[PDB]
Design an enzyme around this catalytic site. Structure first.
Site, PDB file in Angstrom:
ATOM      1  N   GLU A 211      -3.039 -14.568   4.743  1.00  0.00           N
ATOM      2  CA  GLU A 211      -1.996 -13.653   4.256  1.00  0.00           C
ATOM      3  C   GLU A 211      -0.829 -13.760   5.206  1.00  0.00           C
ATOM      4  OE1 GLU A 211      -2.550  -9.582   2.784  1.00  0.00           O
ATOM      5  OE2 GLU A 211      -0.445  -9.358   3.042  1.00  0.00           O
ATOM      6  N   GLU A 256      -0.619 -12.453  -0.845  1.00  0.00           N
ATOM      7  CA  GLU A 256       0.741 -12.261  -0.392  1.00  0.00           C
ATOM      8  C   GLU A 256       1.193 -13.293   0.634  1.00  0.00           C
ATOM      9  OE1 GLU A 256       0.155  -7.913   0.412  1.00  0.00           O
ATOM     10  OE2 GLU A 256       1.390  -7.645  -1.406  1.00  0.00           O
ATOM     11  N   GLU A 332      -4.455  -6.157  -8.287  1.00  0.00           N
ATOM     12  CA  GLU A 332      -4.344  -4.838  -7.732  1.00  0.00           C
ATOM     13  C   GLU A 332      -3.539  -4.028  -8.766  1.00  0.00           C
ATOM     14  OE1 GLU A 332      -2.343  -4.950  -3.707  1.00  0.00           O
ATOM     15  OE2 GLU A 332      -3.533  -6.915  -3.302  1.00  0.00           O
ATOM     16  N   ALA A 334      -2.819   0.540 -10.093  1.00  0.00           N
ATOM     17  CA  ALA A 334      -3.183   1.960  -9.846  1.00  0.00           C
ATOM     18  C   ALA A 334      -3.335   2.328  -8.345  1.00  0.00           C
ATOM     19  CB  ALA A 334      -4.462   2.356 -10.607  1.00  0.00           C
ATOM     20  N   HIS A 335      -2.167   2.295  -7.619  1.00  0.00           N
ATOM     21  CA  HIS A 335      -2.079   2.528  -6.168  1.00  0.00           C
ATOM     22  C   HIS A 335      -2.522   3.959  -5.855  1.00  0.00           C
ATOM     23  CE1 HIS A 335      -0.227   2.464  -2.027  1.00  0.00           C
ATOM     24  NE2 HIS A 335      -0.821   1.222  -2.004  1.00  0.00           N
ATOM     25  N   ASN A 392       5.262   1.210  13.015  1.00  0.00           N
ATOM     26  CA  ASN A 392       4.004   1.447  12.269  1.00  0.00           C
ATOM     27  C   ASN A 392       4.322   1.866  10.854  1.00  0.00           C
ATOM     28  OD1 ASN A 392       3.695   4.458  11.658  1.00  0.00           O
ATOM     29  ND2 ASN A 392       4.152   4.384  13.882  1.00  0.00           N
TER      30      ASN A 392
HETATM   31 MG   LIG Z   1       7.775   3.111  10.305  1.00  0.00          MG
HETATM   32 NA    NA Z   2      -1.925   0.028   2.355  1.00  0.00          NA
END
Ligand SMILES: [Mg+2]
Ligand code: NA
Ligand SMILES: CC(C)S[C@@H]1O[C@H](CO)[C@H](O)[C@H](O)[C@H]1O
Ligand SMILES: [Mg+2]
Ligand code: NA
Ligand code: NA
Ligand code: NA
EC number: 3.2.1.23
Lengths: 409, 204
Positions: A211, A256, A332, A334-335, A392
């Site tokens: 990835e 990805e 993927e 339906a988050h 983050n």
């Molecule tokens: Mg941030």
């Molecule tokens: Na995530």
């Protein structure tokens, strides 16, 4: 980071089984099958060696074949004197599916003609055929409807260390909640997972550990020949390890990482080496020359998101674009981040109505929250930024259908 | 341009069109039309007729035209709208999102039809939006689909003009008549008026 999966010592003989591949092919109605097992050895060949492959149903031996080493001629220089392929006929085999995970046991013995065993290897075998025909992904000739989920290897106390109890808990909860498939987002899993999926019955998408999302553009490395070697190992070594698991029904090139020529080469390598399973890959638009299945992430049911280069068409529309004929199963959808799953019924209604919409894998199983302790010793669930990590992505790590401790949302 | 062949009242509908003895008669209806109209640029598609089921005669004739005049696609809705005698999926009254799974001759949602396993043809409804009386509700739903889906290439509304006939009262005043107003029976009453315009061309 660290030594996060098991460490073992294995003592093999110098003349040994170094690899074995099990394949199952069928007649038109699945009332007959041939199990073919190619066995490779390392060590000194001797005319007295033999390989026997036996198939068992429970305590009953149903088929067996024995032969000396020495494969069919393959080219002008001969054949592999260090290989042999055994072919076992099996009548009315019990078929494997996620609904009825019927399994047999194949035992591979490296032995001498006169009966001494040198060593034996073995695996559980599920008789199933996976193929794409007329635009449909078929299992034992019937079209699947994938009730899947993406599952990362995550434990709130242990990090990325997986254990049997947890794996089992997860499968039980998945099955209990009508899931029939799982995608190994986004790397090969701990070996035990495959065994449990084979035995409890879940369809698995095995995905290579590649990835490169953060590159710009995303295929910067995957389109570069200089990175084909590193990538190749991620895919080939995964196939070499997991190809005999019946639960694995589809191989995935990674996630990805845009669409690069390295993907094409690797797609072709798998197709050549293991014609028994479709290969999928979402990068670069979800319908590239490196995928047998249109497998978008987050494409909507009725609404188009016509991004340049990589549009996410409504799934109903995608199927019928000029010249398209492949099945569509979202890698993927339906988050499930926080209070979510809005619109889930929309997907299902579509999946049921359109034959070629064969389901998808929800994102995702479990929240990746970590336990921290407050001065007082009371624990609490932590997310990105909570360990002083920065930059983050805050709560983006919690997208599960269940909390980290397996309690349902 | 469509052949003057319609055998709707037969039971089953392809009774005559699957009968070789009717091949000759059908054949003249298709061939003489092509011979007459093949130089008109406005004709872009030939049709084998209407509501006559799907019979082998259709297959033969579909091939005949493909052979004599490769310049235009051939369509035919009979027998399910997607048989071997049509280059275009050309259903009548198939709905946008709702399936109508009649046995043998289902009318799938048009969006779903395009993508059935193995299907690859374009879809243009030969008839849709039955404009009988106060009607045309849901018209915009077709148009939104036509624009979103490449392979949904439109359709032919049913139909242009009401087939009402003028009759005169006791006072000599005219009035619009329909089925049964001429002593005709049995008859299908108002089903003959389905147009976007009145018989005198005033718009509905
Ligand atoms: Mg941030
Ligand atoms: Na995530
Ligand atoms: C009424 C249906 C069984 S047949 C239906 O009738 C319509 C009435 O205007 C048109 O003639 C259509 O072409 C026909 O399919
Ligand atoms: Mg009547
Ligand atoms: Na479906
Ligand atoms: Na269109
Ligand atoms: Na009518």
């Amino acid at each position: 980071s660290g030594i996060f999966r098991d460490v073992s010592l294995l003592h093999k003989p110098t003349t040994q089984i170094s690899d074995f591949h099990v394949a199952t092919r069928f007649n038109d109605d699945f009332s007959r099958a041939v199990l073919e097992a190619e066995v490779q050895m390392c060590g000194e060949l001797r005319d007295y060696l033999r390989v026997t492959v036996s198939l068992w149903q429970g305590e009953t031996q149903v088929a067996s074949g024995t032969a000396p080493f020495g494969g069919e001629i393959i080219d002008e220089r001969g054949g592999y004197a260090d290989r042999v392929t055994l072919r076992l006929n099996v009548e009315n085999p019990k078929l494997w599916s996620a609904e009825i995970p019927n399994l047999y046991r194949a035992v591979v013995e490296l032995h001498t003609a006169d009966g001494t065993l040198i060593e034996a290897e073995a695996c559980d075998v599920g008789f199933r055929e996976v193929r794409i025909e007329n635009g449909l992904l078929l299992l034992n000739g019937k079209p699947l409807l994938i009730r899947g989920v993406n599952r990362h290897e995550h434990h709130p106390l242990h990090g990325q260390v997986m254990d049997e109890q947890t794996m089992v808990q997860d499968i039980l909860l998945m099955k209990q909640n009508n899931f029939n498939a799982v995608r190994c987002s986004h790397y090969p899993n701990h070996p035990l997972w495959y065994t449990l999926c084979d035995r409890y019955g879940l369809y698995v998408v095995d995905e290579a550990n590649i990835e490169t999302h953060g590159m710009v553009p995303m295929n910067r490395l995957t389109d570069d020949p200089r990175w084909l070697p590193a990538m190749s190992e991620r895919v080939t070594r995964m196939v070499q390890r997991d190809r005999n698991h019946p639960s694995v029904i589809i191989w995935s090139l990674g996630n990805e990482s845009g669409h690069g020529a390295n993907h094409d080469a690797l797609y072709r390598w798998i197709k050549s080496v293991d014609p028994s399973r479709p290969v999928q890959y979402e990068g670069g638009g979800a319908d590239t020359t490196a995928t047998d299945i249109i497998c978008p992430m987050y494409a909507r049911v009725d609404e188009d998101q016509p991004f340049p280069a990589v549009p996410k068409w409504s799934i109903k529309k995608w199927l019928s674009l000029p010249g398209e004929t492949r099945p569509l199963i979202l890698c993927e959808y339906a988050h499930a981040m926080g209070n979510s799953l809005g619109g889930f019924a929309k997907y299902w209604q579509a999946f049921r109505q359109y034959p070629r919409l064969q389901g998808g894998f929800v994102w995702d199983w479990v929240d990746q929250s970590l336990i921290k302790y407050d001065e007082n010793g009371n624990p609490w669930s932590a997310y990105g930024g909570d360990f002083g990590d920065t930059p983050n992505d805050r709560q983006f790590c919690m997208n599960g259908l269940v909390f980290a401790d397996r309690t349902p949302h």
